């Protein structure tokens, strides 16, 4: 009947029950797209590349209408000042762009197969 000193925090059983049911339901919702009352479960609203391309579009359009030469802002970072390779000079933006397909996801199969 003795639980503990009550100065050490106790997590309730409802926290584990919610955790257990939520993990199982998340797995089931990922396996069956189209059956969540006709819908599916996404993990984001907008692609970061899509948002950055829209913001660059509006930024260079506003720069051009103000009478200046427009600038493109690069995800990851700008160039390094080196002289040995093109890939070392532009490494940060190249590193952002090389990660495109796993950033988009998902890492699980997109369609259901019955074994």
């Amino acid at each position: 009947v003795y639980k503990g000193p009550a100065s050490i925090p106790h997590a309730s059983a409802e926290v584990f029950g919610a955790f257990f049911l939520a993990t199982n339901t998340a797995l089931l919702a990922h396996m069956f797209p189209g059956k969540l009352f006709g819908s599916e479960l996404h993990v984001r609203k907008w692609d970061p590349d899509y948002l950055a391309s829209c913001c660059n579009e509006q930024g260079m359009r506003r720069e051009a209408l103000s009478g200046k030469k427009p600038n493109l802002w690069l995800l990851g970072g700008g160039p390094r000042l080196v002289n040995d390779s093109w890939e070392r000079m532009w490494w940060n933006n190249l590193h952002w762009k090389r990660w495109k397909v796993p950033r988009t996801g998902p890492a699980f199969p997109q369609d259901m197969y019955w074994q």
């Binding site: 899509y50 829209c54 660059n56 493109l72 890939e87 000079m89 190249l94 090389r98 397909v101």
Partner: protein, 59 residues
Amino acid sequence: EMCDIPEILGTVQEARQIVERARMWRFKPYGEVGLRMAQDANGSPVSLMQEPLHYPHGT
């Protein structure tokens, strides 16, 4: 046996057909060749308009 003129014309016609179908594989979006070899007047990389949902700048 050496080709006559109509055989040369026929194979040039078919090769141009093949070359069009071959150039359909030329800019894989976010492929390595496009990321490293598509550059502006200087050596700077450009943002190619190949993204599947955004058509910027009145395109």
